[PDB]
mmCIF file of C-alpha atoms in Angstrom:
data_model
loop_
_atom_site.group_PDB
_atom_site.id
_atom_site.type_symbol
_atom_site.label_atom_id
_atom_site.label_comp_id
_atom_site.label_asym_id
_atom_site.label_seq_id
_atom_site.Cartn_x
_atom_site.Cartn_y
_atom_site.Cartn_z
ATOM 1 C CA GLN W 2 0.000 0.000 0.000
ATOM 2 C CA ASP W 3 2.867 2.445 0.736
ATOM 3 C CA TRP W 4 6.750 2.728 0.697
ATOM 4 C CA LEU W 5 7.184 1.856 4.422
ATOM 5 C CA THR W 6 4.770 -1.149 4.235
ATOM 6 C CA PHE W 7 6.539 -2.256 0.982
ATOM 7 C CA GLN W 8 9.867 -2.198 2.890
ATOM 8 C CA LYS W 9 8.467 -4.246 5.805
ATOM 9 C CA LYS W 10 6.819 -6.867 3.494
ATOM 10 C CA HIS W 11 9.386 -7.159 0.656
ATOM 11 C CA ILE W 12 12.902 -5.892 1.649
ATOM 12 C CA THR W 13 15.330 -7.801 3.958
ATOM 13 C CA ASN W 14 18.205 -5.531 5.080
ATOM 14 C CA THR W 15 17.869 -1.726 5.669
ATOM 15 C CA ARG W 16 20.771 -2.174 8.292
ATOM 16 C CA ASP W 17 18.124 -0.109 10.145
ATOM 17 C CA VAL W 18 16.728 -3.172 11.988
ATOM 18 C CA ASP W 19 12.887 -3.099 12.629
ATOM 19 C CA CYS W 20 13.193 -3.498 16.466
ATOM 20 C CA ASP W 21 9.410 -3.715 17.196
ATOM 21 C CA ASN W 22 8.821 -6.368 14.460
ATOM 22 C CA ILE W 23 12.035 -8.446 14.928
ATOM 23 C CA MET W 24 12.086 -8.437 18.791
ATOM 24 C CA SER W 25 8.404 -9.589 18.944
ATOM 25 C CA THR W 26 9.360 -12.655 16.735
ATOM 26 C CA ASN W 27 9.543 -16.038 18.567
ATOM 27 C CA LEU W 28 13.420 -16.096 18.373
ATOM 28 C CA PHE W 29 13.768 -12.906 20.556
ATOM 29 C CA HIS W 30 10.406 -13.260 22.450
ATOM 30 C CA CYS W 31 10.162 -9.583 23.617
ATOM 31 C CA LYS W 32 13.523 -9.790 25.543
ATOM 32 C CA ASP W 33 14.947 -6.410 26.804
ATOM 33 C CA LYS W 34 17.968 -6.119 24.460
ATOM 34 C CA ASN W 35 19.575 -7.594 21.337
ATOM 35 C CA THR W 36 22.580 -6.499 19.236
ATOM 36 C CA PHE W 37 22.617 -7.120 15.450
ATOM 37 C CA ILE W 38 25.885 -7.035 13.471
ATOM 38 C CA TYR W 39 25.764 -5.571 9.922
ATOM 39 C CA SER W 40 28.127 -8.066 8.196
ATOM 40 C CA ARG W 41 28.191 -11.261 6.122
ATOM 41 C CA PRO W 42 28.842 -14.347 8.287
ATOM 42 C CA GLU W 43 32.478 -14.787 7.039
ATOM 43 C CA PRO W 44 34.291 -11.786 8.671
ATOM 44 C CA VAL W 45 32.414 -12.618 11.943
ATOM 45 C CA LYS W 46 33.273 -16.371 11.957
ATOM 46 C CA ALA W 47 36.984 -15.388 11.246
ATOM 47 C CA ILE W 48 37.151 -13.771 14.750
ATOM 48 C CA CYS W 49 37.304 -17.410 16.054
ATOM 49 C CA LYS W 50 39.934 -18.600 13.498
ATOM 50 C CA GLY W 51 41.986 -21.288 15.341
ATOM 51 C CA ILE W 52 40.267 -21.121 18.793
ATOM 52 C CA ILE W 53 38.975 -24.628 19.864
ATOM 53 C CA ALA W 54 38.589 -24.358 23.679
ATOM 54 C CA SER W 55 35.684 -22.078 24.836
ATOM 55 C CA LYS W 56 37.211 -18.539 25.062
ATOM 56 C CA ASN W 57 35.883 -14.921 24.901
ATOM 57 C CA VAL W 58 37.507 -12.882 22.045
ATOM 58 C CA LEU W 59 37.310 -9.142 21.129
ATOM 59 C CA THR W 60 37.223 -8.185 17.373
ATOM 60 C CA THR W 61 40.443 -6.443 16.149
ATOM 61 C CA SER W 62 38.274 -4.030 13.970
ATOM 62 C CA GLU W 63 34.895 -2.203 14.291
ATOM 63 C CA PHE W 64 31.563 -3.391 12.829
ATOM 64 C CA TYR W 65 28.247 -1.580 12.256
ATOM 65 C CA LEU W 66 26.083 -2.534 15.342
ATOM 66 C CA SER W 67 22.269 -2.058 15.695
ATOM 67 C CA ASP W 68 21.088 -2.309 19.393
ATOM 68 C CA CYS W 69 17.318 -2.783 20.154
ATOM 69 C CA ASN W 70 16.617 -1.594 23.776
ATOM 70 C CA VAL W 71 13.107 -2.055 25.351
ATOM 71 C CA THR W 72 11.236 1.127 26.460
ATOM 72 C CA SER W 73 8.708 1.324 29.376
ATOM 73 C CA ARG W 74 5.963 0.055 26.925
ATOM 74 C CA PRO W 75 6.083 -3.778 26.850
ATOM 75 C CA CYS W 76 7.898 -5.190 23.743
ATOM 76 C CA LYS W 77 8.356 -1.636 22.267
ATOM 77 C CA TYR W 78 12.003 -0.649 21.480
ATOM 78 C CA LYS W 79 14.354 2.149 20.478
ATOM 79 C CA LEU W 80 17.115 1.476 17.859
ATOM 80 C CA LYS W 81 20.714 2.626 18.656
ATOM 81 C CA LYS W 82 23.159 2.447 15.640
ATOM 82 C CA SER W 83 26.949 2.615 16.144
ATOM 83 C CA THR W 84 30.294 1.247 14.859
ATOM 84 C CA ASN W 85 32.349 -0.608 17.505
ATOM 85 C CA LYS W 86 34.315 -3.707 18.404
ATOM 86 C CA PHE W 87 32.407 -6.564 20.105
ATOM 87 C CA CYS W 88 33.217 -9.683 22.131
ATOM 88 C CA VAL W 89 31.994 -13.297 21.332
ATOM 89 C CA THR W 90 32.591 -16.723 22.982
ATOM 90 C CA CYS W 91 34.650 -18.861 20.512
ATOM 91 C CA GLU W 92 34.155 -22.680 20.649
ATOM 92 C CA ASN W 93 35.663 -25.018 17.986
ATOM 93 C CA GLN W 94 36.575 -21.974 15.843
ATOM 94 C CA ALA W 95 33.020 -20.419 15.650
ATOM 95 C CA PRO W 96 31.153 -17.635 17.539
ATOM 96 C CA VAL W 97 28.518 -19.397 19.782
ATOM 97 C CA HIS W 98 27.594 -16.404 22.091
ATOM 98 C CA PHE W 99 27.461 -12.536 21.938
ATOM 99 C CA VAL W 100 29.160 -11.265 25.162
ATOM 100 C CA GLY W 101 29.252 -7.477 24.723
ATOM 101 C CA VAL W 102 29.925 -4.300 22.740
ATOM 102 C CA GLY W 103 33.307 -2.525 23.225
ATOM 103 C CA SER W 104 34.743 -5.043 25.749
ATOM 104 C CA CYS W 105 34.666 -8.754 26.805
ATOM 105 C CA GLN D 2 24.784 -21.678 21.955
ATOM 106 C CA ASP D 3 26.035 -22.648 18.488
ATOM 107 C CA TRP D 4 27.248 -20.862 15.273
ATOM 108 C CA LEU D 5 23.882 -21.354 13.458
ATOM 109 C CA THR D 6 21.804 -19.868 16.322
ATOM 110 C CA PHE D 7 24.406 -17.046 16.716
ATOM 111 C CA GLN D 8 23.933 -16.126 12.991
ATOM 112 C CA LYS D 9 20.061 -16.128 13.331
ATOM 113 C CA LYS D 10 20.239 -13.943 16.475
ATOM 114 C CA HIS D 11 23.055 -11.426 15.590
ATOM 115 C CA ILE D 12 23.925 -11.395 11.817
ATOM 116 C CA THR D 13 21.912 -8.964 9.612
ATOM 117 C CA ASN D 14 23.389 -9.827 6.125
ATOM 118 C CA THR D 15 23.255 -13.712 5.885
ATOM 119 C CA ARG D 16 21.520 -13.759 2.415
ATOM 120 C CA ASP D 17 19.402 -16.503 4.138
ATOM 121 C CA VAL D 18 15.928 -15.358 5.319
ATOM 122 C CA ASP D 19 14.680 -17.007 8.581
ATOM 123 C CA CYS D 20 11.346 -18.071 6.948
ATOM 124 C CA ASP D 21 9.981 -20.021 9.994
ATOM 125 C CA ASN D 22 10.686 -16.929 12.217
ATOM 126 C CA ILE D 23 9.614 -14.153 9.785
ATOM 127 C CA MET D 24 6.495 -15.687 8.143
ATOM 128 C CA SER D 25 4.758 -16.344 11.514
ATOM 129 C CA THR D 26 4.656 -12.562 12.329
ATOM 130 C CA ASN D 27 1.608 -10.221 12.187
ATOM 131 C CA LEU D 28 2.896 -9.101 8.791
ATOM 132 C CA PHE D 29 2.896 -12.481 6.950
ATOM 133 C CA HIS D 30 0.380 -14.435 9.157
ATOM 134 C CA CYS D 31 1.698 -17.858 7.840
ATOM 135 C CA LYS D 32 0.736 -17.053 4.174
ATOM 136 C CA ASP D 33 1.701 -19.578 1.427
ATOM 137 C CA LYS D 34 4.421 -17.379 -0.164
ATOM 138 C CA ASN D 35 6.416 -14.171 0.203
ATOM 139 C CA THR D 36 9.322 -12.819 -1.930
ATOM 140 C CA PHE D 37 12.105 -10.817 -0.186
ATOM 141 C CA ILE D 38 14.483 -8.453 -2.046
ATOM 142 C CA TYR D 39 17.977 -8.668 -0.447
ATOM 143 C CA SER D 40 19.108 -5.038 -0.698
ATOM 144 C CA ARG D 41 19.080 -1.759 1.204
ATOM 145 C CA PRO D 42 15.917 0.200 0.300
ATOM 146 C CA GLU D 43 17.777 2.982 -1.689
ATOM 147 C CA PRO D 44 18.318 1.085 -5.007
ATOM 148 C CA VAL D 45 14.708 -0.291 -4.619
ATOM 149 C CA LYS D 46 13.130 3.220 -4.108
ATOM 150 C CA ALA D 47 15.239 4.462 -7.139
ATOM 151 C CA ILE D 48 13.279 2.013 -9.413
ATOM 152 C CA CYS D 49 10.416 4.562 -8.964
ATOM 153 C CA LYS D 50 12.709 7.615 -9.462
ATOM 154 C CA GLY D 51 10.449 10.413 -10.843
ATOM 155 C CA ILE D 52 7.137 8.463 -11.227
ATOM 156 C CA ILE D 53 4.163 10.208 -9.451
ATOM 157 C CA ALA D 54 1.064 8.567 -11.025
ATOM 158 C CA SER D 55 0.544 4.881 -9.936
ATOM 159 C CA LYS D 56 2.372 2.761 -12.597
ATOM 160 C CA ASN D 57 3.855 -0.796 -12.837
ATOM 161 C CA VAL D 58 7.669 -0.740 -13.507
ATOM 162 C CA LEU D 59 9.950 -3.736 -14.257
ATOM 163 C CA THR D 60 13.507 -3.233 -12.812
ATOM 164 C CA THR D 61 16.143 -2.634 -15.551
ATOM 165 C CA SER D 62 18.609 -5.090 -13.759
ATOM 166 C CA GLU D 63 18.505 -8.183 -11.501
ATOM 167 C CA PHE D 64 18.324 -8.270 -7.691
ATOM 168 C CA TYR D 65 19.006 -11.169 -5.233
ATOM 169 C CA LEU D 66 15.530 -12.545 -4.311
ATOM 170 C CA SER D 67 14.589 -15.060 -1.553
ATOM 171 C CA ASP D 68 11.143 -16.783 -1.659
ATOM 172 C CA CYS D 69 9.664 -18.385 1.487
ATOM 173 C CA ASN D 70 7.484 -21.269 0.151
ATOM 174 C CA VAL D 71 5.110 -23.064 2.574
ATOM 175 C CA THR D 72 5.465 -26.871 2.918
ATOM 176 C CA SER D 73 2.491 -29.250 3.461
ATOM 177 C CA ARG D 74 3.185 -28.658 7.232
ATOM 178 C CA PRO D 75 1.351 -25.350 7.975
ATOM 179 C CA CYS D 76 3.800 -22.442 8.675
ATOM 180 C CA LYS D 77 6.936 -24.536 7.900
ATOM 181 C CA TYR D 78 8.776 -23.027 4.865
ATOM 182 C CA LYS D 79 11.559 -23.769 2.341
ATOM 183 C CA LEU D 80 13.850 -20.949 1.133
ATOM 184 C CA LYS D 81 14.451 -20.557 -2.629
ATOM 185 C CA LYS D 82 17.269 -18.100 -3.614
ATOM 186 C CA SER D 83 17.570 -16.604 -7.156
ATOM 187 C CA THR D 84 18.578 -13.400 -9.017
ATOM 188 C CA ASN D 85 15.937 -11.851 -11.307
ATOM 189 C CA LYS D 86 14.114 -8.671 -12.353
ATOM 190 C CA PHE D 87 10.789 -7.854 -10.631
ATOM 191 C CA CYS D 88 7.761 -5.598 -11.146
ATOM 192 C CA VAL D 89 6.522 -3.013 -8.562
ATOM 193 C CA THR D 90 3.660 -0.476 -8.590
ATOM 194 C CA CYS D 91 5.307 3.012 -8.301
ATOM 195 C CA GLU D 92 3.292 5.846 -6.713
ATOM 196 C CA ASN D 93 4.939 9.256 -5.893
ATOM 197 C CA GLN D 94 8.471 7.979 -6.758
ATOM 198 C CA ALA D 95 8.219 5.000 -4.314
ATOM 199 C CA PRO D 96 7.462 1.244 -4.613
ATOM 200 C CA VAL D 97 4.031 0.578 -2.949
ATOM 201 C CA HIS D 98 3.137 -3.012 -4.207
ATOM 202 C CA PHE D 99 5.174 -6.101 -5.312
ATOM 203 C CA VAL D 100 3.536 -7.232 -8.629
ATOM 204 C CA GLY D 101 5.822 -10.219 -9.435
ATOM 205 C CA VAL D 102 9.176 -11.746 -10.452
ATOM 206 C CA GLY D 103 10.526 -11.602 -14.055
ATOM 207 C CA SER D 104 7.576 -9.613 -15.487
ATOM 208 C CA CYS D 105 4.531 -7.436 -14.588
#
Protein backbone atom coordinates (compact mmCIF):
# COMPACT_ATOMS: atom_id res chain seq x y z
CA GLN A 1 0.00 0.00 0.00
CA ASP A 2 2.87 2.44 0.74
CA TRP A 3 6.75 2.73 0.70
CA LEU A 4 7.18 1.86 4.42
CA THR A 5 4.77 -1.15 4.24
CA PHE A 6 6.54 -2.26 0.98
CA GLN A 7 9.87 -2.20 2.89
CA LYS A 8 8.47 -4.25 5.80
CA LYS A 9 6.82 -6.87 3.49
CA HIS A 10 9.39 -7.16 0.66
CA ILE A 11 12.90 -5.89 1.65
CA THR A 12 15.33 -7.80 3.96
CA ASN A 13 18.20 -5.53 5.08
CA THR A 14 17.87 -1.73 5.67
CA ARG A 15 20.77 -2.17 8.29
CA ASP A 16 18.12 -0.11 10.15
CA VAL A 17 16.73 -3.17 11.99
CA ASP A 18 12.89 -3.10 12.63
CA CYS A 19 13.19 -3.50 16.47
CA ASP A 20 9.41 -3.71 17.20
CA ASN A 21 8.82 -6.37 14.46
CA ILE A 22 12.03 -8.45 14.93
CA MET A 23 12.09 -8.44 18.79
CA SER A 24 8.40 -9.59 18.94
CA THR A 25 9.36 -12.66 16.74
CA ASN A 26 9.54 -16.04 18.57
CA LEU A 27 13.42 -16.10 18.37
CA PHE A 28 13.77 -12.91 20.56
CA HIS A 29 10.41 -13.26 22.45
CA CYS A 30 10.16 -9.58 23.62
CA LYS A 31 13.52 -9.79 25.54
CA ASP A 32 14.95 -6.41 26.80
CA LYS A 33 17.97 -6.12 24.46
CA ASN A 34 19.57 -7.59 21.34
CA THR A 35 22.58 -6.50 19.24
CA PHE A 36 22.62 -7.12 15.45
CA ILE A 37 25.89 -7.03 13.47
CA TYR A 38 25.76 -5.57 9.92
CA SER A 39 28.13 -8.07 8.20
CA ARG A 40 28.19 -11.26 6.12
CA PRO A 41 28.84 -14.35 8.29
CA GLU A 42 32.48 -14.79 7.04
CA PRO A 43 34.29 -11.79 8.67
CA VAL A 44 32.41 -12.62 11.94
CA LYS A 45 33.27 -16.37 11.96
CA ALA A 46 36.98 -15.39 11.25
CA ILE A 47 37.15 -13.77 14.75
CA CYS A 48 37.30 -17.41 16.05
CA LYS A 49 39.93 -18.60 13.50
CA GLY A 50 41.99 -21.29 15.34
CA ILE A 51 40.27 -21.12 18.79
CA ILE A 52 38.98 -24.63 19.86
CA ALA A 53 38.59 -24.36 23.68
CA SER A 54 35.68 -22.08 24.84
CA LYS A 55 37.21 -18.54 25.06
CA ASN A 56 35.88 -14.92 24.90
CA VAL A 57 37.51 -12.88 22.04
CA LEU A 58 37.31 -9.14 21.13
CA THR A 59 37.22 -8.19 17.37
CA THR A 60 40.44 -6.44 16.15
CA SER A 61 38.27 -4.03 13.97
CA GLU A 62 34.89 -2.20 14.29
CA PHE A 63 31.56 -3.39 12.83
CA TYR A 64 28.25 -1.58 12.26
CA LEU A 65 26.08 -2.53 15.34
CA SER A 66 22.27 -2.06 15.70
CA ASP A 67 21.09 -2.31 19.39
CA CYS A 68 17.32 -2.78 20.15
CA ASN A 69 16.62 -1.59 23.78
CA VAL A 70 13.11 -2.06 25.35
CA THR A 71 11.24 1.13 26.46
CA SER A 72 8.71 1.32 29.38
CA ARG A 73 5.96 0.06 26.93
CA PRO A 74 6.08 -3.78 26.85
CA CYS A 75 7.90 -5.19 23.74
CA LYS A 76 8.36 -1.64 22.27
CA TYR A 77 12.00 -0.65 21.48
CA LYS A 78 14.35 2.15 20.48
CA LEU A 79 17.11 1.48 17.86
CA LYS A 80 20.71 2.63 18.66
CA LYS A 81 23.16 2.45 15.64
CA SER A 82 26.95 2.61 16.14
CA THR A 83 30.29 1.25 14.86
CA ASN A 84 32.35 -0.61 17.51
CA LYS A 85 34.32 -3.71 18.40
CA PHE A 86 32.41 -6.56 20.11
CA CYS A 87 33.22 -9.68 22.13
CA VAL A 88 31.99 -13.30 21.33
CA THR A 89 32.59 -16.72 22.98
CA CYS A 90 34.65 -18.86 20.51
CA GLU A 91 34.15 -22.68 20.65
CA ASN A 92 35.66 -25.02 17.99
CA GLN A 93 36.57 -21.97 15.84
CA ALA A 94 33.02 -20.42 15.65
CA PRO A 95 31.15 -17.63 17.54
CA VAL A 96 28.52 -19.40 19.78
CA HIS A 97 27.59 -16.40 22.09
CA PHE A 98 27.46 -12.54 21.94
CA VAL A 99 29.16 -11.27 25.16
CA GLY A 100 29.25 -7.48 24.72
CA VAL A 101 29.92 -4.30 22.74
CA GLY A 102 33.31 -2.53 23.23
CA SER A 103 34.74 -5.04 25.75
CA CYS A 104 34.67 -8.75 26.80
CA GLN B 1 24.78 -21.68 21.96
CA ASP B 2 26.03 -22.65 18.49
CA TRP B 3 27.25 -20.86 15.27
CA LEU B 4 23.88 -21.35 13.46
CA THR B 5 21.80 -19.87 16.32
CA PHE B 6 24.41 -17.05 16.72
CA GLN B 7 23.93 -16.13 12.99
CA LYS B 8 20.06 -16.13 13.33
CA LYS B 9 20.24 -13.94 16.47
CA HIS B 10 23.06 -11.43 15.59
CA ILE B 11 23.93 -11.39 11.82
CA THR B 12 21.91 -8.96 9.61
CA ASN B 13 23.39 -9.83 6.13
CA THR B 14 23.25 -13.71 5.88
CA ARG B 15 21.52 -13.76 2.41
CA ASP B 16 19.40 -16.50 4.14
CA VAL B 17 15.93 -15.36 5.32
CA ASP B 18 14.68 -17.01 8.58
CA CYS B 19 11.35 -18.07 6.95
CA ASP B 20 9.98 -20.02 9.99
CA ASN B 21 10.69 -16.93 12.22
CA ILE B 22 9.61 -14.15 9.78
CA MET B 23 6.50 -15.69 8.14
CA SER B 24 4.76 -16.34 11.51
CA THR B 25 4.66 -12.56 12.33
CA ASN B 26 1.61 -10.22 12.19
CA LEU B 27 2.90 -9.10 8.79
CA PHE B 28 2.90 -12.48 6.95
CA HIS B 29 0.38 -14.43 9.16
CA CYS B 30 1.70 -17.86 7.84
CA LYS B 31 0.74 -17.05 4.17
CA ASP B 32 1.70 -19.58 1.43
CA LYS B 33 4.42 -17.38 -0.16
CA ASN B 34 6.42 -14.17 0.20
CA THR B 35 9.32 -12.82 -1.93
CA PHE B 36 12.11 -10.82 -0.19
CA ILE B 37 14.48 -8.45 -2.05
CA TYR B 38 17.98 -8.67 -0.45
CA SER B 39 19.11 -5.04 -0.70
CA ARG B 40 19.08 -1.76 1.20
CA PRO B 41 15.92 0.20 0.30
CA GLU B 42 17.78 2.98 -1.69
CA PRO B 43 18.32 1.09 -5.01
CA VAL B 44 14.71 -0.29 -4.62
CA LYS B 45 13.13 3.22 -4.11
CA ALA B 46 15.24 4.46 -7.14
CA ILE B 47 13.28 2.01 -9.41
CA CYS B 48 10.42 4.56 -8.96
CA LYS B 49 12.71 7.62 -9.46
CA GLY B 50 10.45 10.41 -10.84
CA ILE B 51 7.14 8.46 -11.23
CA ILE B 52 4.16 10.21 -9.45
CA ALA B 53 1.06 8.57 -11.03
CA SER B 54 0.54 4.88 -9.94
CA LYS B 55 2.37 2.76 -12.60
CA ASN B 56 3.85 -0.80 -12.84
CA VAL B 57 7.67 -0.74 -13.51
CA LEU B 58 9.95 -3.74 -14.26
CA THR B 59 13.51 -3.23 -12.81
CA THR B 60 16.14 -2.63 -15.55
CA SER B 61 18.61 -5.09 -13.76
CA GLU B 62 18.51 -8.18 -11.50
CA PHE B 63 18.32 -8.27 -7.69
CA TYR B 64 19.01 -11.17 -5.23
CA LEU B 65 15.53 -12.55 -4.31
CA SER B 66 14.59 -15.06 -1.55
CA ASP B 67 11.14 -16.78 -1.66
CA CYS B 68 9.66 -18.39 1.49
CA ASN B 69 7.48 -21.27 0.15
CA VAL B 70 5.11 -23.06 2.57
CA THR B 71 5.47 -26.87 2.92
CA SER B 72 2.49 -29.25 3.46
CA ARG B 73 3.18 -28.66 7.23
CA PRO B 74 1.35 -25.35 7.98
CA CYS B 75 3.80 -22.44 8.67
CA LYS B 76 6.94 -24.54 7.90
CA TYR B 77 8.78 -23.03 4.86
CA LYS B 78 11.56 -23.77 2.34
CA LEU B 79 13.85 -20.95 1.13
CA LYS B 80 14.45 -20.56 -2.63
CA LYS B 81 17.27 -18.10 -3.61
CA SER B 82 17.57 -16.60 -7.16
CA THR B 83 18.58 -13.40 -9.02
CA ASN B 84 15.94 -11.85 -11.31
CA LYS B 85 14.11 -8.67 -12.35
CA PHE B 86 10.79 -7.85 -10.63
CA CYS B 87 7.76 -5.60 -11.15
CA VAL B 88 6.52 -3.01 -8.56
CA THR B 89 3.66 -0.48 -8.59
CA CYS B 90 5.31 3.01 -8.30
CA GLU B 91 3.29 5.85 -6.71
CA ASN B 92 4.94 9.26 -5.89
CA GLN B 93 8.47 7.98 -6.76
CA ALA B 94 8.22 5.00 -4.31
CA PRO B 95 7.46 1.24 -4.61
CA VAL B 96 4.03 0.58 -2.95
CA HIS B 97 3.14 -3.01 -4.21
CA PHE B 98 5.17 -6.10 -5.31
CA VAL B 99 3.54 -7.23 -8.63
CA GLY B 100 5.82 -10.22 -9.43
CA VAL B 101 9.18 -11.75 -10.45
CA GLY B 102 10.53 -11.60 -14.05
CA SER B 103 7.58 -9.61 -15.49
CA CYS B 104 4.53 -7.44 -14.59
